[PDB]
């Protein structure tokens, strides 16, 4: 006996993956849809985190300038 345990891990891992993808919330999606929606979500989040990190770098540069204006007075 080794095959039914392995496909039961697949099934549980599909459910966990599905539950982590916000667009799949409350949807009994197919296996293909779970995979495709998770792929798309990863690409969406990577871009969104990159944009946030760039905004943070901008704010650090603005704040460093402001603090220099403050210290100059």
């Amino acid at each position: 006996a080794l095959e039914r345990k392995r496909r039961d891990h697949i099934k549980d891992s599909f459910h966990s993956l599905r539950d982590s993808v916000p667009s799949l919330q409350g949807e009994k999606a197919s296996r293909a849809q779970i995979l495709d929606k998770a792929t798309e979500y990863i690409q969406y989040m990577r871009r969104k985190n990159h944009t946030h990190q760039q905004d943070i770098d901008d704010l650090k540069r603005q704040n460093a300038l402001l603090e220099q204006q403050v210290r100059a007075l």
């Binding site: 392995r6 891990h9 697949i10 891992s13 599909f14 966990s16 993956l17 982590s20 993808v21 296996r31 293909a32 995979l35 495709d36 998770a38 792929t39 979500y41 990863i42 690409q43 989040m45 990577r46 969104k48 985190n49 946030h52 990190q53 905004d55 943070i56 704010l59 650090k60 603005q62 704040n63 402001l66 603090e67 204006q69 403050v70 007075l73």
Partner: protein
């Protein structure tokens, strides 16, 4: 009839697994990563980018509050 359509879903699912695997840095083109590893590592990676998004929004919020504090201090000094 259902046998040819069955293999077509199996082929599309296999391509779906590879496309997901190609998105995970730890698994990127790891040719032999089994299905349950791709699922588990994709879940872990997804949770990491959600945690990262929360961290950056928090960092960004603090920096914006610091910016407004600094602008207020600058204006106070210029008017004192």
């Amino acid at each position: 009839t259902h046998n040819v359509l069955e293999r077509q879903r199996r082929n599309e699912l296999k391509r779906s697994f590879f496309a997901l695997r190609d998105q995970i840095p730890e698994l990127e083109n790891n040719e032999k990563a089994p299905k349950v590893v791709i699922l588990k590592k994709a879940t872990a990676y997804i949770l990491s980018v959600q945690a990262e998004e929360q961290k950056l929004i928090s960092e960004e919020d603090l920096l914006r509050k610091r910016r407004e504090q600094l602008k207020h201090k600058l204006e106070q000094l210029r008017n004192s």
